[PDB]
Design an enzyme around this catalytic site. Sequence first.
Site, mmCIF file in Angstrom:
data_model
loop_
_atom_site.group_PDB
_atom_site.id
_atom_site.type_symbol
_atom_site.label_atom_id
_atom_site.label_comp_id
_atom_site.label_asym_id
_atom_site.label_seq_id
_atom_site.Cartn_x
_atom_site.Cartn_y
_atom_site.Cartn_z
ATOM 1 N N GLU A 63 -101.797 18.191 -24.700
ATOM 2 C CA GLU A 63 -101.096 17.359 -23.674
ATOM 3 C C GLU A 63 -101.962 16.116 -23.589
ATOM 4 O O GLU A 63 -101.645 15.033 -23.252
ATOM 5 C CB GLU A 63 -101.425 18.111 -22.221
ATOM 6 C CG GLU A 63 -100.693 17.161 -21.201
ATOM 7 C CD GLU A 63 -101.400 17.570 -19.788
ATOM 8 O OE1 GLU A 63 -102.532 17.630 -19.684
ATOM 9 O OE2 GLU A 63 -100.589 17.650 -18.846
ATOM 10 N N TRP A 85 -94.701 20.996 -18.718
ATOM 11 C CA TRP A 85 -93.880 19.866 -17.805
ATOM 12 C C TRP A 85 -92.778 19.990 -17.815
ATOM 13 O O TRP A 85 -92.068 18.889 -17.516
ATOM 14 C CB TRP A 85 -94.507 18.449 -18.040
ATOM 15 C CG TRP A 85 -95.877 18.080 -17.776
ATOM 16 C CD1 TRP A 85 -96.989 17.654 -18.791
ATOM 17 C CD2 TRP A 85 -96.347 17.604 -16.876
ATOM 18 N NE1 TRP A 85 -97.968 17.420 -18.134
ATOM 19 C CE2 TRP A 85 -98.128 17.279 -16.790
ATOM 20 C CE3 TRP A 85 -95.792 17.769 -15.489
ATOM 21 C CZ2 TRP A 85 -98.423 17.079 -15.822
ATOM 22 C CZ3 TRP A 85 -96.269 17.323 -14.319
ATOM 23 C CH2 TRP A 85 -97.699 17.048 -14.336
ATOM 24 N N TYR A 111 -98.935 9.701 -16.086
ATOM 25 C CA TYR A 111 -100.171 9.501 -16.740
ATOM 26 C C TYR A 111 -100.262 8.795 -17.873
ATOM 27 O O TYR A 111 -100.694 7.845 -17.914
ATOM 28 C CB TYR A 111 -100.874 10.935 -16.939
ATOM 29 C CG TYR A 111 -101.021 11.690 -15.640
ATOM 30 C CD1 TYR A 111 -102.002 11.349 -14.915
ATOM 31 C CD2 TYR A 111 -100.028 12.475 -15.175
ATOM 32 C CE1 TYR A 111 -102.110 12.155 -13.892
ATOM 33 C CE2 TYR A 111 -100.551 13.460 -14.161
ATOM 34 C CZ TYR A 111 -101.453 12.959 -13.424
ATOM 35 O OH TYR A 111 -101.747 13.907 -12.135
ATOM 36 N N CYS A 171 -101.602 14.000 -9.823
ATOM 37 C CA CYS A 171 -102.523 14.916 -9.218
ATOM 38 C C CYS A 171 -104.064 14.447 -9.267
ATOM 39 O O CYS A 171 -105.030 14.584 -8.499
ATOM 40 C CB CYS A 171 -102.575 16.242 -9.641
ATOM 41 S SG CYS A 171 -101.394 17.232 -8.805
ATOM 42 N N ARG A 191 -106.208 14.625 -5.885
ATOM 43 C CA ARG A 191 -105.684 14.691 -4.678
ATOM 44 C C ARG A 191 -104.893 15.932 -4.231
ATOM 45 O O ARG A 191 -104.940 16.376 -3.018
ATOM 46 C CB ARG A 191 -104.213 13.751 -4.699
ATOM 47 C CG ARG A 191 -103.218 14.070 -5.617
ATOM 48 C CD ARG A 191 -101.991 13.268 -5.363
ATOM 49 N NE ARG A 191 -100.806 13.702 -5.811
ATOM 50 C CZ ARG A 191 -100.287 15.010 -5.679
ATOM 51 N NH1 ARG A 191 -100.526 15.622 -4.244
ATOM 52 N NH2 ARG A 191 -99.199 15.424 -5.808
ATOM 53 N N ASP A 194 -104.051 23.257 -7.410
ATOM 54 C CA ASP A 194 -103.626 24.606 -7.469
ATOM 55 C C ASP A 194 -104.832 25.263 -7.970
ATOM 56 O O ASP A 194 -104.860 25.475 -9.079
ATOM 57 C CB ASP A 194 -102.246 24.759 -8.163
ATOM 58 C CG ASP A 194 -101.950 26.072 -8.026
ATOM 59 O OD1 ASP A 194 -102.608 27.002 -7.540
ATOM 60 O OD2 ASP A 194 -100.867 26.220 -8.473
HETATM 61 C C1 LIG Z 1 -97.131 23.921 -8.451
HETATM 62 C C2 LIG Z 1 -96.631 22.985 -9.227
HETATM 63 C C3 LIG Z 1 -95.476 22.478 -8.896
HETATM 64 C C4 LIG Z 1 -94.658 21.621 -9.565
HETATM 65 O O1 LIG Z 1 -93.664 21.089 -8.904
HETATM 66 N N1 LIG Z 1 -95.128 21.112 -10.754
HETATM 67 C C5 LIG Z 1 -96.361 21.354 -11.165
HETATM 68 S S1 LIG Z 1 -97.064 21.014 -12.560
HETATM 69 C C6 LIG Z 1 -98.418 22.329 -12.450
HETATM 70 C C7 LIG Z 1 -99.643 22.404 -13.490
HETATM 71 O O2 LIG Z 1 -100.459 23.289 -13.091
HETATM 72 C C8 LIG Z 1 -99.838 21.626 -14.554
HETATM 73 C C9 LIG Z 1 -100.921 21.050 -14.897
HETATM 74 C C10 LIG Z 1 -101.374 20.438 -16.084
HETATM 75 C C11 LIG Z 1 -100.137 20.105 -16.641
HETATM 76 C C12 LIG Z 1 -99.095 20.592 -16.409
HETATM 77 C C13 LIG Z 1 -98.631 21.162 -15.383
HETATM 78 C C14 LIG Z 1 -98.258 22.973 -11.071
HETATM 79 N N2 LIG Z 1 -99.370 23.698 -10.658
HETATM 80 C C15 LIG Z 1 -96.902 22.577 -10.482
HETATM 81 O O1 LIG Z 2 -102.053 18.301 -13.230
HETATM 82 C C1 LIG Z 2 -101.456 19.202 -12.251
HETATM 83 C C2 LIG Z 2 -100.224 18.740 -11.591
HETATM 84 C C3 LIG Z 2 -99.772 19.582 -10.523
HETATM 85 N N1 LIG Z 2 -100.793 20.306 -9.870
HETATM 86 C C4 LIG Z 2 -100.422 20.957 -8.605
HETATM 87 C C5 LIG Z 2 -100.964 21.096 -7.208
HETATM 88 C C6 LIG Z 2 -99.701 21.487 -6.401
HETATM 89 O O2 LIG Z 2 -99.433 22.707 -6.360
HETATM 90 C C7 LIG Z 2 -98.609 20.821 -7.078
HETATM 91 C C8 LIG Z 2 -98.308 19.614 -6.544
HETATM 92 O O3 LIG Z 2 -97.541 19.202 -5.567
HETATM 93 P P1 LIG Z 2 -97.892 18.037 -4.607
HETATM 94 O O4 LIG Z 2 -99.356 17.483 -5.016
HETATM 95 O O5 LIG Z 2 -96.667 17.211 -5.105
HETATM 96 O O6 LIG Z 2 -97.601 18.679 -3.453
HETATM 97 O O7 LIG Z 2 -98.953 21.012 -8.273
HETATM 98 C C9 LIG Z 2 -102.047 20.548 -10.230
HETATM 99 O O8 LIG Z 2 -102.763 21.536 -9.715
HETATM 100 N N2 LIG Z 2 -102.426 20.072 -11.424
#
Ligand SMILES: Cc1cc(O)nc2sc(C(=O)c3ccccc3)c(N)c12
Ligand SMILES: O=c1ccn([C@H]2C[C@H](O)[C@@H](COP(=O)(O)O)O2)c(=O)[nH]1
Lengths: 289, 282
Positions: A63, A85, A111, A171, A191, A194
């Site tokens: 990535e 993604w 990004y 994020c 910002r 998770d």
């Molecule tokens: C909770 C969540 C919700 C969403 O709509 N999109 C994403 S993408 C992501 C990731 O952890 C992530 C981190 C790095 C690259 C791609 C996805 C979430 N937790 C997440």
């Molecule tokens: O690279 C990433 C992309 C997304 N998220 C997470 C956190 C939140 O759970 C969710 C994003 O939701 P919002 O910030 O839009 O609420 O995805 C990450 O932790 N890392």
Amino acid sequence: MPPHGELQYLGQIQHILRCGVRKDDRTGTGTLSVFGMQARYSLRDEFPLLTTKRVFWKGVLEELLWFIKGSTNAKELSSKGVKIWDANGSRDFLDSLGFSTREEGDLGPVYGFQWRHFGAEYRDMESDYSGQGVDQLQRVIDTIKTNPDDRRIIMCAWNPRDLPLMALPPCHALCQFYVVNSELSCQLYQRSGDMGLGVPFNIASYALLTYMIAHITGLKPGDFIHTLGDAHIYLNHIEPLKIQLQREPRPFPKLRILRKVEKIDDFKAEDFQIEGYNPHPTIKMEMAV
Amino acid sequence: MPPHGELQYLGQIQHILRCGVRKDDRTGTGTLSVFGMQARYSLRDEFPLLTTKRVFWKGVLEELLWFIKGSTNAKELSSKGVKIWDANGSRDFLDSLGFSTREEGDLGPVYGFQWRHFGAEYRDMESDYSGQGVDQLQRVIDTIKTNPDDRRIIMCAWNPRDLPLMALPPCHALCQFYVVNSELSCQLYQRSGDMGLGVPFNIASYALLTYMIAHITGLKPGDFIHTLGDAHIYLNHIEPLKIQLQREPRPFPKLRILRKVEKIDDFKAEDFQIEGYNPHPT
Ligand SMILES: Cc1cc(O)nc2sc(C(=O)c3ccccc3)c(N)c12
Ligand SMILES: O=c1ccn([C@H]2C[C@H](O)[C@@H](COP(=O)(O)O)O2)c(=O)[nH]1
Ligand SMILES: O=c1ccn([C@H]2C[C@H](O)[C@@H](COP(=O)(O)O)O2)c(=O)[nH]1
């Protein structure tokens, strides 16, 4: 000896479980959240890829490389076997956003686009952008080479103007680099994180990033500093995480870079070797899409 | 005067329609066909992109860069907008070949693999092959660059030992390059080609290839010679083909290169501009 680095993260988890607070949210899952956290992760010589749970190193690496190309194509990545993604690039998800006429996979100006073509007018994930916008990445690289002392070395992904077009706003609002004693450090401001699923992934990425640039500019890797705004745990992650809390960290791996790379762009997947990664088994954690 | 130049293609068309012989195939359709044809296309300050029917140039281009990567990932290509191999990277079609145990999009050791890793042991598409096998494409440039009088400049994609694993056995078995008077020429052997959809696409690919390599080597492009084995026309393509056939060929476009590239790998689609391509509809 010094404590294990991974205990930064694990302690954070535990803070959120004890001192967290229940907010609701889009997914309908709910969270325990904390606002404002920070961790330091030495990058010498260890490499903070977490151990108490197997991290997706394949996707982490691919990535990143997908970023440096300047890609916002979820299906170009997804082809490599990295579906992180796709949930956000699917026809389904897009449509629900108003992007009825956007191609499946088109993440918008996230990004890849901001890191190399900031300010450029974003048409679609396949358009020619060369020369357009600000190339935050090289401007960064070049600076660390000729002005290590600069307090301004910054990549910013947060573009208010481009927001409406992103499938998901960054994020990683921004990150900043730092040199002293020829030791390249990096801090990321994130910002929303998770704690369960995403944050381990993210740590490894910016650590990797840090290492890549240290290589290009002749420097040795120092710290990675992880700053957080809305640190949360989805309520359907609590059980799984509690599981992982009982595990005792195994020593971090080391990262070998197998050949002298001149420009950031001609990095390849098979240039990186991970040594001694002995993680506990994975834990499935539902992605709250 | 003789043809010159998109007239050769058409000439080839006419000949099959006139002197062809109907012969069934895989896909039941059936075809008029001729065995053994050859045409000659000049690359000298024009570029052989047929004008009597539109040629999907984005695909010629992206697919070539895909080959040069060394890729066999059908998905990697589709992502880039070009969906031509997508048909044979499908689970439905793939495990029709018994490749159940294989990820979707994994065409197998087709072109991109042979070009750059001939004779290596293919595992799957997302795998590392560094230094494995014979790099036919680089070994070609290197020769041209040091022994232009060599008559062994062959890039061959027909590996009898890997056919079992290929989603589809290559139409372009081999191409030979040839240099004289600082002009680089290319001949392709195409075992099977249909003048309707495929063949025009293939001309473009190789003409392109020659332009890239000529660039890398400091030579002016010469001829592209296109040799065919089973040259055919699909019986439903006959009507449309008869129509196209009475279109007056417009002049070949030019092809420019917008920067000086050191290696063959550093080519990027943006590096190419077409100029004055004015085809008919379809
Ligand atoms: C909770 C969540 C919700 C969403 O709509 N999109 C994403 S993408 C992501 C990731 O952890 C992530 C981190 C790095 C690259 C791609 C996805 C979430 N937790 C997440
Ligand atoms: O690279 C990433 C992309 C997304 N998220 C997470 C956190 C939140 O759970 C969710 C994003 O939701 P919002 O910030 O839009 O609420 O995805 C990450 O932790 N890392
Ligand atoms: O690059 C290509 C790939 C395939 N074909 C054609 C010709 C035949 O119609 C068919 C191949 O079938 P067989 O050769 O396997 O029969 O596809 C081409 O013309 N060009």
